[PDB]
Structure 1
Amino acid sequence: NEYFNSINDSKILSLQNKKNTLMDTSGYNAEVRVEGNVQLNPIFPFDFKLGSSGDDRGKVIVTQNENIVYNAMYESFSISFWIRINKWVSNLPGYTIIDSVKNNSGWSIGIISNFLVFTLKQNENSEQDINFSYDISKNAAGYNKWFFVTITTNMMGNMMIYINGKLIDTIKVKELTGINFSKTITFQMNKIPNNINMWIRDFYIFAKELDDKDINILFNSLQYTNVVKDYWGNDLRYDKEYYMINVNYMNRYMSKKGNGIVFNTRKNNNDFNEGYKIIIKRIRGNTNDTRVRGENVLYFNTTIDNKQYSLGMYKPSRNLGTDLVPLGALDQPMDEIRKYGSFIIQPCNTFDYYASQLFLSSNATTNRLGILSIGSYSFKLGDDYWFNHEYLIPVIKIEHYASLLESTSTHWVFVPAS
């Protein structure tokens, strides 16, 4: 795969984490100082963490050698990295997160409100910037997911910004005389006059202008595709409590009536703190390392009252439709769970969310009998006696699901109860 090699040749700075230490694996060997409280993840993705807290707070400084800066100080360059910010609310005040400016000239990345802005500066008067705005409708609880930023900048060409491989906003670079690029880049959360976290990982800078096919290769090479992710982009894990949500129904939480699992309307969308939680339990794995991966056969438990149930098929009070059968909370032994409560997970990640599809399994094997979806149906549950009622329920389509195989009503996400 030379495509990958051709890009790496142009790499002037590669801020990676090896041996539990931040360093420059570019080969040009930059200086990396780690001041303050900077958590460093031992587990992949070997990310490093920073805060907005006062006093001793995290600071990472990187100093590049004069020779290699001077050459690339006026031509073409790109910046690419993974970022995550927790409680990135829409009313958030302005912050500078990554900054590379010495004497009123350079480049600077910052976040304010629903915007992540990238400024280019020459002097104290004039400055040209590009930004990415997050869709507040889709992210009422805050844009708290991991996302991969890529900024290409050609000095007499174009200055574009990418998120997750998708081009977002693009503007024309202005005449910038007297623009001196600093030899220092500082990762630190500094407020702007008039408690959040930030995770960074794989901060690369290139000496050329990367194209669409290059960016998207980079994006895809820099993730484990077969590791299913939670809502925020972290490795989805077994034996961990999550809130199970359908992509088409982000304003519903999970509840129970009789044997039936029923979805209900969230009171608010500040937090995800509502309804019953589930735990994912493993059955069959190509690997056995706590992480949930594609083609793993699995099942779901959940503690409702002081009992613990497992999600599994049941016979509804009347027929809901052809080949259609509801999923519910059942107190069933492992033999029943293998017949009627096992699923095969497949990751499905888009620009909007990190989700997954769930296929009904045949006797806990990877052979597929159906697909887990969601719908509103009229039947009896619990104390219901006189009339049928409409319930929004999880439902498995059996045998013929090629239609639903592409529907976003089959995309499920998992939000931790942290």
Structure 2
Amino acid sequence: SAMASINDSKILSLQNKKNALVDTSGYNAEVRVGDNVQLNTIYTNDFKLSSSGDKIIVNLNNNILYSAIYENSSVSFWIKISKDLTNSHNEYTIINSIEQNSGWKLCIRNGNIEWILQDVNRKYKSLIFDYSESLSHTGYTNKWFFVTITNNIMGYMKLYINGELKQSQKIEDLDEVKLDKTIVFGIDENIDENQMLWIRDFNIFSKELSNEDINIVYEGQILRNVIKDYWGNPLKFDTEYYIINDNYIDRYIAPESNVLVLVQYPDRSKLYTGNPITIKSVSDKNPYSRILNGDNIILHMLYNSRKYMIIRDTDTIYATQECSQNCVYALKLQSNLGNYGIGIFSIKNIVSKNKYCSQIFSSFRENTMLLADIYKPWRFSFKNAYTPVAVTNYETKLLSTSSFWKFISRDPGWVEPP
């Protein structure tokens, strides 16, 4: 099978075992983790480079007969780069195997990540990807994204992002590139507070992975059944989120006359605007545990310093009385907290390479899916509102962006002043 072929080719795999980051490929690289480097804070095999001088040094135990590279190879990992590091016009070297002349290195510079392969003469080839897109919400500033480098020493070096090919450069025309002996993770440039990044699931393979192979690794490491927050972190219970609809990214959820509506951000550049919603486990899973596909959840909104439970309206938005076809329900708040079916929802990941988003469903009385669009949701006013609603008969809306929700947590990689 493709997968066996894949995993079998692993010649370095940095994973957390017994609370230490080590090489689990079988090849016994020495992995020296700096004393202040925090491991396993978001995902099991992650590490955070955040304090001055944070470093991980890996010393390979590899071929001693070939001084020069003799086989194809690939490198994969996920990376998440803070807003403050992204906003710098400076250049930062993040991973480096160049000891004297040859080797490769990963750099960040003005919202771009650049991969460099260099030979013994310092002739080099470069692959670049603009992950920031000038801090756009569509881009990947402070967002987990899968990077993959494949090398055909007698062909091309390719750069993939989330399994999509971005850039190719011939490397067959380089002269000698020596086998790596040491790989250094860490920034040596002077950094400011809040300039941090995370790396997870670092692997090197002894072959040039096909695009098909790469998508298999990508899908396997994304953890398909773990719901994600906006940044690509696992979504957690008991954690504050600013919840936004994909069709109205600069509007926040707010109660107006006890009907939830979407109010426009006064400043589109400030993500953390609105009324934080905390997600509660109905089955009583551990505090702060990860939320998964199929979990029953309850939503609590913090509004003007008080907590309320978000519930579906018992009646439909317009009067024709008991509805059982094409029904639309507004959402409301109640101060009585407890397990009420009318307030129980379930969240399901949407498969997308460019957004971390989910659909939210209710099965109370009638099966509904939450979406946002323009409605007249008040019983005593004809006023329109961008309104989050629970709608029945939603089969034709399953691919509609109006049904996609994102959960923005206050993340250390995106800092906003009080």
TM-score w.r.t. length of structure 2: 0.87
Task: After TM superposition, give the deviation of residue 35 of structure 1 in Å.
Answer: 2.9
Distance (Å, rounded) in 2 between the aligned partners of 1:371 and 1:41: 34
The one-letter code sitting in structure 1 at the alignment partner of 2:25 is S
State the SS of the aligned residue for 2:384: strand
CA, structure 1 residues 317+187, in 2 after alignment: closer, same or farther (shift >3 Å)? closer
**2:55 paired residue number:** 59
Q: 1:72 to 1:293 in 2, by over 3 A?
A: farther
Q: Who is 1:329 aligned against?
A: 333
Residue ranges of structure 1 left out of the alignment (5+ in a row): none
1:371 is the counterpart of 2:373: no
Aligned length, in residue pairs: 401
In structure 2, the residue matched to 1:153 is: 151
CA distance in 2 between counterparts of 1:333 and 1:416 reads: 23
CA positional deviation for 1:124: 6.4
8 Å CA contact 2:77, 2:199 repeated in 1: yes
> Of 358, 380, 389, which residue of structure 1 is paired with 2:383?
389
In structure 2, stretches of 5+ residues that fail to align are 412-418
- For 1:403, which of 396, 400, 408 is the aligned residue? 396
Paired with 2:161 and 2:80, the residues of 1 have a C-alpha distance of: 12
- 2:99 pairs with 1:97: no
1:289-322, Cα deviation, whole Å (9 max, x unpaired): 7221111111211121243212122357745994
Aligned twin of 2:306: 307
Q: Tell me the SS of whatever aligns to 1:248.
A: coil
Sort the Cα spacing of 1:156 and 1:268 in 2 relative to 1 into closer, same or farther, 3 A. farther
Structure 2: distance between partners of 1:312 and 1:98: 48
What is aligned with 2:293?
294
2:344 aligns with 342
Q: Which residue of 2 aligns with 1:26?
A: 25
Change in Cα spacing, 1:417 to 1:198, as seen in structure 2 (3 Å) is: closer
When residues 259 and 268 of structure 1 are mapped into structure 2, their CA distance, relative to the original with a 3 A threshold, is: same
Q: Distance in 1 between matches of 2:249 and 2:209?
A: 36
| CA contact 1:20–1:42 (8 Å) conserved in 2 | no
Match in the other structure for 1:357:
359
Asked if structure 1 preserves the Cα contact closer than 8 Å seen for 2:107 and 2:114, the reply is yes
Query: Which SS does the other structure have where 2:212 is aligned?
Result: helix
**2:311–2:334 CA contact under 8 A, matched in 1:** yes
Match of 2:416 in 1: none
C-alpha distance in structure 2 between counterparts of 1:264 and 1:72, whole Å: 61
Deviations 1:141-198 (A, max 9, x none): 96111112111011221111111212222233351114334311100023399x3112
Aligned residue number for residue 183 of structure 2: 185
CA contact (8 A) 1:89 1:142 kept: no
- Give 1:45's aligned residue: 44
Give the direction of change, closer, same or farther, for the CA distance of 1:42–1:95 in structure 2 (3 Å limit): closer
One-letter amino acid matched to 1:61: I
Matched, 1:258 2:252: no
More strand, by proportion: 1
Partners of 1:35 and 1:257 in 2: how far apart? Answer: 51
The alpha-carbon deviation at position 224 of structure 1 amounts to 2.5
Contact map agreement 1:83 1:146 (CA 8 A) in 2 = yes
| Residue pair 2:262, 2:386 contacting (<8 A) in 1 also | yes
| 1:11-33 Cα distance to aligned partner (Å, 9 max, x none) | 22112221111211121111112
Q: CA deviation at 1:111?
A: 0.9
1:119 corresponds, among 106, 116, 120, to 116
